Amino acid sequence: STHFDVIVVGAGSMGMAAGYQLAKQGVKTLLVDAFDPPHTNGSHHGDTRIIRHAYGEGREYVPLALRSQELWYELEKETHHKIFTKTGVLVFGPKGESAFVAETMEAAKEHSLTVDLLEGDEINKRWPGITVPENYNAIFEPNSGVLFSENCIRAYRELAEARGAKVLTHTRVEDFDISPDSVKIETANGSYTADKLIVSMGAWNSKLLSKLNLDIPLQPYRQVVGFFESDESKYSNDIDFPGFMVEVPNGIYYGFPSFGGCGLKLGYHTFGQKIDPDTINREFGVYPEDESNLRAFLEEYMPGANGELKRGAVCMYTKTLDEHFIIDLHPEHSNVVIAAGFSGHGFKFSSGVGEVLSQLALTGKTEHDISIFSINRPALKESLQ
């Protein structure tokens, strides 16, 4: 017997941010999650996340990146949890052979972002611990950094709840009933209604959007990360080793400086196992590629950070065909908002997206230009059942 103004299904990176934005405005919100956020079953754990402004995936993301950065600084001031460390982000690759590096440079120029350009030995000299061939070039963004993702979700949740938002945990939504003037969700712990619905189930969007009569190609990928004992005099955040995302012949890698001695963290971005979110093996090390693809990068580019494996994590990316997000109203229901297919690069925008989802649910519009994330774009290959 409890109607809500807005129901958020999936209270992770996007959902909890939306919950906070709504609660902050006095909107009676209910957030439902299959687990208890922040947790290690979705796409937001592993402690840290990179936030970049000059965007290699496309200069069109810059405005949202900058707005999210300001929102992260706001969050830092509101909670006792640590939110952001300004490590700076280094992007490098073989000269003339990296669309990622090239677009990062164009994005910086187009938006007048503050960056340093360097190449070859200048890279190795500036950051002892990095060994790149002389034909490599780079763009460093000093004001970009590292977000503590689990802390962000925890902070958004504590703040939203302090303002009246309710979070129903360990409750998996199994079906939806949408009408022109209301929405309803069904779970084993009961059913709930509201005027608006925000759907942000992460990897599970690939399995349950069909319950909303949507048919969108979405592929979940198993993506691991490892923490390695490193030479702290070189790879510690304390001596300014940066976060980084780089392109080499066999793909894109990313990493973080060692924070408080927990070790340099590394991940292989362009390769992962296609999986189903309910059958994925969440144990690091079960596939030999988990650790080997990482050491293959370290022994070659960051040899002093190739020590004992201290920790591993298994997480998921949910890719769309063009690797751009889906943030829009359900094409048949203006009272339903969809947030999906973040394709391995959405956390840094979660604060900004929470704001967009909020506007979409309350007004059916957003002040942000979100056309590139349209659910009706052709490259997406979307359709109704």
Ligand SMILES: *Cc1cc2c(cc1C)nc1c(=O)[nH]c(=O)nc-1n2C[C@H](O)[C@H](O)[C@H](O)COP(=O)(O)OP(=O)(O)OC[C@H]1O[C@@H](n2cnc3c(N)ncnc32)[C@H](O)[C@@H]1O
């Ligand atoms: C996995 C990964 C991702 C990643 C990254 C490194 C790894 C190993 N590094 C990143 C980085 O440095 N910078 C960045 O900007 N992004 C990075 N990413 C990607 C980012 O983490 C993902 O894009 C982001 O987390 C996506 O967020 P979203 O909110 O979509 O996903 P979630 O946080 O997993 O939340 C979904 C929640 O919904 C719940 N759920 C699922 N099904 C149900 C049902 N049926 N009912 C109720 N709740 C449901 C989940 O439990 C989850 O909490």
Ligand SMILES: O=C([O-])c1ccc[nH]1
């Ligand atoms: O989007 C990013 O910055 C990122 C780093 C690792 C995966 N995604």
Ligand SMILES: [Cl-]
């Ligand atoms: Cl993702």
